[PDB]
Amino acid sequence: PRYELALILKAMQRPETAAALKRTLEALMDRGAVVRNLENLGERMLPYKISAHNQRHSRGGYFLVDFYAPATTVESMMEHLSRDIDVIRPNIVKHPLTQEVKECEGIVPVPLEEKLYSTKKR
Amino acid sequence: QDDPPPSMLLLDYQNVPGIHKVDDVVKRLLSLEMANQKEKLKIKKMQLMNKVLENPEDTSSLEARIVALTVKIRNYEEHMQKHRKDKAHKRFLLMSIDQRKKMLKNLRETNYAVFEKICKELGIEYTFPPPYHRKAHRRWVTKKALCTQVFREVQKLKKQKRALRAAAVAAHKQG
Amino acid sequence: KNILKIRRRKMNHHKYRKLVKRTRFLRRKVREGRLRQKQVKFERDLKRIWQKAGLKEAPAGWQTPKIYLKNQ
RNA sequence: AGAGUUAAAUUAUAACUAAGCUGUAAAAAGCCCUAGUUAAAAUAAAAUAACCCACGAAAGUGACUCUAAUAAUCCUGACACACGAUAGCUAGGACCCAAACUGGGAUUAGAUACCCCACUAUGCCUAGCCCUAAACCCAAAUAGUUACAUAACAAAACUA
RNA sequence: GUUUACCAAAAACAUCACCUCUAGCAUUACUAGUAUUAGAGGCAAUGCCUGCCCAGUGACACCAGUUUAACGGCCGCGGUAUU
Ligand SMILES: [Mg+2]
Ligand SMILES: [Mg+2]
Ligand SMILES: [Mg+2]
Ligand SMILES: [Mg+2]
Ligand SMILES: [Mg+2]
Ligand SMILES: [Mg+2]
Ligand SMILES: [Mg+2]
Ligand SMILES: [Mg+2]
Ligand SMILES: [Mg+2]
Ligand SMILES: [Mg+2]
Ligand SMILES: [Mg+2]
Ligand SMILES: [Mg+2]
Ligand SMILES: [Mg+2]
Ligand SMILES: [Mg+2]
Ligand SMILES: [Mg+2]
Ligand SMILES: [Mg+2]
Ligand SMILES: [Mg+2]
Ligand SMILES: [Mg+2]
Ligand SMILES: [Mg+2]
Ligand SMILES: [Mg+2]
Ligand SMILES: [Mg+2]
Ligand SMILES: [Mg+2]
Ligand SMILES: [Mg+2]
Ligand SMILES: [Mg+2]
Ligand SMILES: [Mg+2]
Ligand SMILES: [Mg+2]
Numbered sequence: 001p002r003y004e005l006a007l008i009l010k011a012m013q014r015p016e017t018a019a020a021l022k023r024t025l026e027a028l029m030d031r032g033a034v035v036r037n038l039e040n041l042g043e044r045m046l047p048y049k050i051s052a053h054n055q056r057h058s059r060g061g062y063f064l065v066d067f068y069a070p071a072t073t074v075e076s077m078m079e080h081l082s083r084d085i086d087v088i089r090p091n092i093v094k095h096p097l098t099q100e101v102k103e104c105e106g107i108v109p110v111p112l113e114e115k116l117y118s119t120k121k122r
Numbered sequence: 123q124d125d126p127p128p129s130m131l132l133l134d135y136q137n138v139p140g141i142h143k144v145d146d147v148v149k150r151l152l153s154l155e156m157a158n159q160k161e162k163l164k165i166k167k168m169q170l171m172n173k174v175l176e177n178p179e180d181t182s183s184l185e186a187r188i189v190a191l192t193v194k195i196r197n198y199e200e201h202m203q204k205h206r207k208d209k210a211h212k213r214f215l216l217m218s219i220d221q222r223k224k225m226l227k228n229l230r231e232t233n234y235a236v237f238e239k240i241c242k243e244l245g246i247e248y249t250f251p252p253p254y255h256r257k258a259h260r261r262w263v264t265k266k267a268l269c270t271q272v273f274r275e276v277q278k279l280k281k282q283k284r285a286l287r288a289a290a291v292a293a294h295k296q297g
Numbered sequence: 298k299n300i301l302k303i304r305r306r307k308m309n310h311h312k313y314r315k316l317v318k319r320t321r322f323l324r325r326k327v328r329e330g331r332l333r334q335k336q337v338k339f340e341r342d343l344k345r346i347w348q349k350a351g352l353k354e355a356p357a358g359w360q361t362p363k364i365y366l367k368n369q
Numbered sequence: 370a371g372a373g374u375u376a377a378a379u380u381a382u383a384a385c386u387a388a389g390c391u392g393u394a395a396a397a398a399g400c401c402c403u404a405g406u407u408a409a410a411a412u413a414a415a416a417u418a419a420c421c422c423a424c425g426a427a428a429g430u431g432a433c434u435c436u437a438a439u440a441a442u443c444c445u446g447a448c449a450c451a452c453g454a455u456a457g458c459u460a461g462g463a464c465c466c467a468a469a470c471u472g473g474g475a476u477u478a479g480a481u482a483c484c485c486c487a488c489u490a491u492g493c494c495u496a497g498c499c500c501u502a503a504a505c506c507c508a509a510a511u512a513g514u515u516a517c518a519u520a521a522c523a524a525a526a527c528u529a
Numbered sequence: 530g531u532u533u534a535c536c537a538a539a540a541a542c543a544u545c546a547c548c549u550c551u552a553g554c555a556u557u558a559c560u561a562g563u564a565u566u567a568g569a570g571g572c573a574a575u576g577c578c579u580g581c582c583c584a585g586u587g588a589c590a591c592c593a594g595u596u597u598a599a600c601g602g603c604c605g606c607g608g609u610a611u612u
Contacts, residue, residue, distance in 0.1 A: 002156070003435095032155070034147065034150070034151065034156075047376095048376075051409090051410095068151055068156050069156070070155055070156055070157075071157075071158060071159065071435085071436065071437095072436080074434090074435055074436075075372065075373075075435075075436075078372095078373065078374090078434085078435080079373085082373085082374095089374090090374095091374085091433085091434065092434065092435065093434070093435085094434090094435080115525080116524085117524080117525090118519095118523090118524080118525045119519090119525070120519090120522095120525090159436085159437065159438090160438095181442085182442065187441085187442075191440085191441080194440080195440095197437095197438090198438090198440095200437090201370085201437060201438070204370085204371075204437075205370045205371060205437080206370090207370070207371095207496095208370035208371080208437095208438090209370085209451080209452060209453095210370070210425080210438080210439070210452095211370075211437090211438070211439085212451070212452085213426080213439095213440085213451065213452070214438080214439070214440055215440090216440090216450070216451060217440045217441080217451085218440045218441075219440090220440085220441090220450090221440055221441045222440095222441095224441085225441085252449095254449095255447085255448085255449035255450090256448080256449080257448080257449075260364040261339065261364060264361075264362060264364060265339075265342070265343065265346075268343050268346065268347070268356070268359065268361070269346060271356040271359060272346060272347045272350050272352065272356055273350075274356075275352060275356045275357070276350050276351065276352065279351075279352075303503085322577095325577080368575070368576060369576065369577085
């Protein structure tokens with residue numbers, strides 16, 4: 001997976017939410033995207049009140065869209081999602097599953113530094 | 123400017139068997155379409171080293187380096203065309219150019235044939251370093267301009283005096 | 298310690314700056330006269346050049362631009 | 370280097386409530402179109418992490434996201450080429466807050482200072498200049514050695 | 530470049546430039562335009578600059594307060610370094 005779209009949607013009923021998700025996904029496929037998956041993180045009360053589109057929002061729905069897109073297009077998508085009034089806040093991140101975990105082999109302990117000063121007898 | 127086509131199926135995935143039998147979607151994810159810029163650069167490097175070189179296997183040869191560097195340089199050129207004020211990459215560009223020109227001065231002193239070829243193929247034009255780098259300033263530029271003009275005038279007037287001499291002595295000798 | 302040297306230079310510079318402030322327009326006049334002199338000597342140089350080359354007038358279309366007197 | 374974004378403050382601005390608020394070693398002047406609480410754009414700046422020691426040639430760089438990207442098969446090298454903190458200059462835009470100058474208030478023998486209040490150039494953005502710093506880690510660059518050997522102090526001594 | 534046709538052609542006027550003020554808008558001017566515009570003025574390209582003053586008089590703000598590239602203003606007397 002290449003990009004990860006973190007989507008925070010206005011908290012709404014079933015049909016309208018499905019609607020927004022649909023037109024958003026379409027909007028993605030239109031900029032040339034291939035959508036791998038859609039996940040739902042549920043609706044929660046937001047960490048802090050978010051002001052967007054002349055509305056101050058308390059709650060919201062959370063979604064992940066993993067997808068492949070040409071490098072060029074991210075900006076484009078962003079623009080779109082900015083002017084959508086049903087989106088509380090967009091973000092697009094290089095997918096966490098592209099970066100792979102190197103091995104902590106342990107903690108190499110650091111010896112106390114030596115020869116910082118001369119052998120002078122005070 | 124060249125064009126490494128959007129469908130070109132990036133370098134590591136070209137030689138794996140039965141690739142073309144795969145459906146359009148996976149073929150598209152492995153395309154230069156979904157690719158980075160660095161992928162297009164890998165491809166451009168390959169294509170150039172194949173077009174220009176003799177033995178694309180040697181990375182160690184002077185000419186191989188000159189090609190790689192030329193790719194890099196062209197990329198920076200592009201970057202600098204988008205970002206005018208980026209000083210970091212203007213440094214990279216100029217620096218790298220100097221490195222290339224140094225390696226060129228080295229090829230021209232060891233293998234002349236290959237040097238000639240490369241210069242033709244990459245469009246690189248090798249110029250000799252002037253003796254005496256000095257800053258050309260207002261006074262010197264202006265004075266030099268005048269001196270050149272005075273020279274041309276003087277020799278032009280000598281030519282006119284010789285045309286008058288020839289005409290006079292000829293019309294005298296005839297009758 | 299070494300600050301004594303630095304103190305000397307400090308004072309000198311300060312004094313000097315003060316001086317330039319006071320003497321400013323005198324200095325201005327003088328620098329302008331020097332630039333005039335410069336332009337003239339440059340002209341003489343060029344005139345000497347085309348004259349010792351045998352020509353009478355300066356070569357066709359030669360205005361001998363003003364480089365020093367260039368508006369600041 | 371681009372483009373997009375904003376958590377904590379802060380403020381225009383209302384709504385209640387209170388007559389004071391601010392300010393110092395102590396006061397005065399200032400402000401009561403003030404103050405506390407509840408609402409809030411823009412602007413600017415980037416707690417904690419950081420007891421870390423990374424990136425960049427140096428200057429520098431530590432809020433978030435993405436794009437582009439960090440010369441040389443790697444010796445030295447200019448007056449040539451390209452950069453270069455803060456301040457400063459030109460033109461346009463921004464202005465919360467800070468603040469040279471300046472004006473008030475104290476202090477003082479004086480006080481064209483230190484302290485208090487107010488406000489400006491300026492700090493910010495775009496484009497172009499300017500090319501300087503105790504630009505100092507006061508320790509040149511590249512390879513090495515820990516042999517000989519303590520002027521003093523400091524960051525031990527040396528070879529090419 | 531302009532001016533006192535018939536006693537003055539100039540150092541007067543205008544002028545590029547720079548500055549103040551006044552305007553948020555439709556069928557006769559400005560203008561079939563719209564603040565990078567249009568009017569009322571000052572001064573005289575460029576260059577270095579344009580210091581201090583809002584008490585008076587104006588003009589804004591119908592009162593406070595703000596304005597000098599608005600009208601205009603920008604000081605003394607006595608004592609001191611042997612002289
Ligand atoms: Mg001295
Ligand atoms: Mg920028
Ligand atoms: Mg504001
Ligand atoms: Mg009081
Ligand atoms: Mg922060
Ligand atoms: Mg490198
Ligand atoms: Mg070198
Ligand atoms: Mg600088
Ligand atoms: Mg400015
Ligand atoms: Mg200011
Ligand atoms: Mg203040
Ligand atoms: Mg005072
Ligand atoms: Mg600045
Ligand atoms: Mg420094
Ligand atoms: Mg030094
Ligand atoms: Mg060196
Ligand atoms: Mg007359
Ligand atoms: Mg007449
Ligand atoms: Mg006349
Ligand atoms: Mg007459
Ligand atoms: Mg006149
Ligand atoms: Mg001016
Ligand atoms: Mg003038
Ligand atoms: Mg004045
Ligand atoms: Mg008044
Ligand atoms: Mg008044």
